[PDB]
Amino acid sequence: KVFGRCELAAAMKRHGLDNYRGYSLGNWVCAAKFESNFNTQATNRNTDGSTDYGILQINSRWWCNDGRTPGSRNLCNIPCSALLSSDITASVNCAKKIVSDGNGMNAWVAWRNRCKGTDVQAWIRGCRL
Ligand SMILES: [Cl-]
Ligand SMILES: [Cl-]
């Protein structure tokens, strides 16, 4: 599913990501834009052989099981395909675990390079939240 910007903002808010671990909702919408263009089906292979899945490009080296990343953890205890659903619950629940691990949203390289330090509130401007 390719979410609309406000559509994804409302879904994230309803799932309690807004202000989670101190990250206002625009941070999550900005990260999702650059990680996946709001497309739940996005997948990308990493150089180490792991793959990133879903709206927040959650990786199989640590967080989900895709059956092909040797030496892996599955810290969210889910198949990586659950992160590609039109229902973003699994992506949100797993993102909450990732952002609570010590490095905050710096775990998402695209958030650090393209959202951190920018006016991230602009990502939810005009949305009826
Ligand atoms: Cl915001
Ligand atoms: Cl933090």
Side-chain angles (χ1 to χ4, degrees), residues 19 23-28 119-124:
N19 307 323
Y23 291 92
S24 70
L25 186 58
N27 288 283
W28 299 104
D119 178 24
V120 299
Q121 186 274 136
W123 290 100
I124 53 171

Side-chain angles (χ1 to χ4, degrees), residues 44-53 59-61 66 68-70 72:
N44 286 289
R45 190 79 92 135
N46 299 135
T47 58
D48 67 1
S50 65
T51 300
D52 301 316
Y53 296 86
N59 185 253
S60 67
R61 168 46 229 258
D66 66 5
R68 66 169 196 192
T69 311
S72 276

Side-chain angles (χ1 to χ4, degrees), residues 32-90:
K33 170 63 179 177
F34 299 114
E35 291 289 3
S36 65
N37 218 2
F38 308 142
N39 182 5
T40 68
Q41 299 192 72
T43 59
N44 286 289
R45 190 79 92 135
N46 299 135
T47 58
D48 67 1
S50 65
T51 300
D52 301 316
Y53 296 86
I55 56 170
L56 287 166
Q57 290 291 282
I58 289 166
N59 185 253
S60 67
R61 168 46 229 258
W62 296 106
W63 312 105
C64 59
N65 173 59
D66 66 5
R68 66 169 196 192
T69 311
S72 276
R73 300 286 288 283
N74 180 9
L75 295 177
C76 292
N77 198 206
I78 44 176
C80 297
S81 62
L83 300 169
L84 307 177
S85 177
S86 58
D87 174 345
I88 69 169
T89 305

Side-chain angles (χ1 to χ4, degrees), residues 10-26:
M12 287 179 154
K13 183 168 183 180
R14 179 171 53 83
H15 279 105
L17 250 202
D18 59 313
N19 307 323
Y20 191 86
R21 287 276 168 162
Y23 291 92
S24 70
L25 186 58

